[PDB]
From a paper:
To correctly aminoacylate tRNALeu, leucyl-tRNA synthetase (LeuRS) catalyzes three reactions: activation of leucine by ATP to form leucyl-adenylate (Leu-AMP), transfer of this amino acid to tRNALeu and post-transfer editing of any mischarged product. Mechanistically similar to other adenylate-forming enzymes, the class Ia aminoacyl-tRNA synthetase (aaRS) LeuRS charges tRNALeu isoacceptors, which are essential substrates for protein translation. We have solved crystal structures for all enzymatic states of Neisseria gonorrhoeae LeuRS during Leu-AMP formation.
To understand the role of this peptide-plane flip on the global conformational changes and its effects on enzymatic catalysis, L550 was mutated to an alanine or glycine and the crystallization of both mutants was performed. These mutants gave rise to the same crystal form as the WT protein by seeding. However, while the NgLeuRS-L550A diffracted as well as WT protein crystals, the NgLeuRS-L550G showed slightly lower diffraction quality in the range of 2.7–3.3 Å. Comparison of the captured apo and pre-transition states of both mutants show the same large domain movement, including closure of the active site by the CP1 hairpin and structurally associated α-helix (M84-N93), that were seen for the WT structures. Despite the occurrence of these substrate-induced changes, including the shift of the priming loop, no peptide-plane flip was observed in either mutant pre-transition state structure. To further investigate the catalytic role of the L550 peptide-plane flip, the NgLeuRS-L550G mutant was tested for Leu-tRNALeu formation under steady-state (multi-turnover) conditions. A 25-fold decrease in the aminoacylation rate constant was observed (5.8 s−1 vs 0.26 s−1) indicating an important role of the peptide-plane flip in LeuRS turnover. In the first assay NgLeuRS-L550G showed only a twofold decrease in the kcat/KM for Leu activation relative to the WT protein. The transient kinetic analysis unambiguously demonstrated a kinetic defect manifested as a 31-fold drop in the single-turnover rate constants for L550G mutant as compared with WT NgLeuRS (1.7 s−1 vs 52 s−1).
Residue numbers in the entry: 1 to 590, 599 to 608, 618 to 813
Amino acid sequence: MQEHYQPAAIEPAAQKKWDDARISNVSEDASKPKYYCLSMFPYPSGKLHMGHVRNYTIGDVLSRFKLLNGFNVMQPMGWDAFGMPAENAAMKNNVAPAAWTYDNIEYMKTQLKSLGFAVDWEREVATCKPEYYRWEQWLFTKLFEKGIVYRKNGTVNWDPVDQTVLANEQVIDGRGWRSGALIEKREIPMYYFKITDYAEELLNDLDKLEHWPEQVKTMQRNWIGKSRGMTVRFAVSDDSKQGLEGDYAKFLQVYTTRPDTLMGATYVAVAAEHPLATAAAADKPELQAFIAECKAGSVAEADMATMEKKGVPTGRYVVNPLNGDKLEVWIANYVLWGYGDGAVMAVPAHDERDFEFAAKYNLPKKQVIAVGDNAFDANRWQEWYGDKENGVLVNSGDLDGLDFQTAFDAVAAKLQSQGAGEPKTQYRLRDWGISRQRYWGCPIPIVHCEKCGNVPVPADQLPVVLPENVVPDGMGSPLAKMPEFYETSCPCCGGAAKRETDTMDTFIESSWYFFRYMSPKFSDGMVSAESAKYWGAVDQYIGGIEHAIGHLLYARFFTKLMRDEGLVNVDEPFERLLTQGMVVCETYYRWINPADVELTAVLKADGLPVVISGTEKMSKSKNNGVDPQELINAYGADTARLFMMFAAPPEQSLEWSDSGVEGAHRFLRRLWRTVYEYLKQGGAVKAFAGNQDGLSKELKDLRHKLHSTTAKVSDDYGRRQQFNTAIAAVMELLNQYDKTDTGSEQGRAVAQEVLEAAVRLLWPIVPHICETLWSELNGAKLWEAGWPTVDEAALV
Ligand SMILES: [Mg+2]
Ligand SMILES: [Zn+2]
């Protein structure tokens, strides 16, 4: 055994000793209990970043732990290969997106092998392979024929200069963020997942997710947005039926979730495209220009309520079917057309949004709900206004004194008896568009025929192969400019036909890849019939916090889709959910990267003083991206993982510090020297076992700290997922070992038990150095020894 810790000597040797026995290559073995640990799989950006190292060390800690407890542990790894970054790296660097993507993957696969993640590399997957995306092309056609996937004209944002569809996250003051040119709303056909058909199941099955964080569950419920409310019809007054036609001249229909406040409505609001707005603006230009203002706007859903609520009145009036008060119709910029009836009512006294609206326009505020003896301030908002569970009605005639639940059913009875109302279930959730007017994505298996319509490619001819010998220039979809691709014969008649030149949303691959891992080479379907049974669903999912409302919901949706096609049994894909914290770092300018910078703050190369700015998430914007490759080169893979799991709990954010990195290194040198100096003073012994009534009190108390730590470390991996405190518990166990005289026959057998357990508890964190130190203390296979057991006799 070497006297000093040389991680470059042991880490690659321990890795080949791990490939020799193939410990992480798992198969369907129903003898050992299965455990499917999954890390969110990365995009081939080029090289790994510090955020990647956290995610995959958290997952490797959990996997190496469960595996040490005798589990069949599947920890697969793949590549989210499609996406725009390969297209921009193609436009700039004059490479093909495929050639760029494959060059990126092989470097990152080397970096991952350098960190020692016990990944089943025999299940590796790349989404840009026809071996993979054929199955989402296959699922497309099956659901397309079933109607769950369909084609319809929706409105999109077109950038006329840079020539591509844009998302509202990229629309700044009506102009694209790259060209800066005024964008045009356009009605193009798109393919849609009918996720609204699965809205109720996607909601109720959240309840069965016992180990999901209710913080995340709540977010899904709100994006789904189920609401039990009332559909009310306000009759158009005889003085305002002009311009309208049919039912629009007879009445105005609204939906409300609080019809127990129908007596409190003081004004209604329609959308800009509502016929009421078109009839009123027929001669009023300020109304015409306001309707034009709302249409040009492209307010994102992430910023949907950030907009100042505005609106002009119409001069037209409707009649409340209850109190009979004649209310004025308003055009408003929050009533969305296509989001239900396209027109709402407004009770300023009990909706905070309608309160801020009425105060803006001096519109009346009729209180109809009272909650106790509280004073109603018609000029200040109070929390007891929007109450739905504790208020009884007032200023409502016969409805005074009912709870909201009885007042709901009461108003429903009156409105239904007239025909002016009805109760209705509604969902904020809208269908899912998956059409990307880009190239580097999964093509859509639809062939257009002027006689047969939009026919899908049959399973025979799948996959519809995406050409890799393409370099996007920048002007529009490169596939629409390739007749050698889109020119084909119609599969339903034989005539000339164009393939669909759009590609699917890169979200599609991420919504089912965890199922492909179970049988990544299976040629007869998405997931093998036999392997989806043994693995069931993912037992642990670790990833970032970005796009949880998006991705996590889609995986839940695809799972239920695939479950309705005999492919899988489970209703839910992920059992346990852990979201890591971002890895942040300080920023420097003169933006200078922290790697080539030193502190007093001067440049590493020139000694040129550069100023230090605030810390951001590790990004390329402010040049704070710390390269984990440089980190491994300095101290090694063990020091990297140890620091990542020690600086903070996985949920909490992580401040990168160069000294804290060096602190994790010195602990490993201390752990190295500790085991060495023990073996220098007389080799190895057999670890202590059994009754202790006979040991010295100085040793009885160390066996206490031992099996106290052995329990706290097990609890910190399996229950709390607090790997930082787990490292601290082992450190304390070591600190008392150093203060204890172990130079006796019994003192040695305890020091073995202390050290044989300490290396095993820290193995999931730092497997290389622990595997090495374990080999010097015991010749049994470390996994044959298993997770350290807790002796309760040492605790009493
Ligand atoms: Mg359950
Ligand atoms: Zn045809």
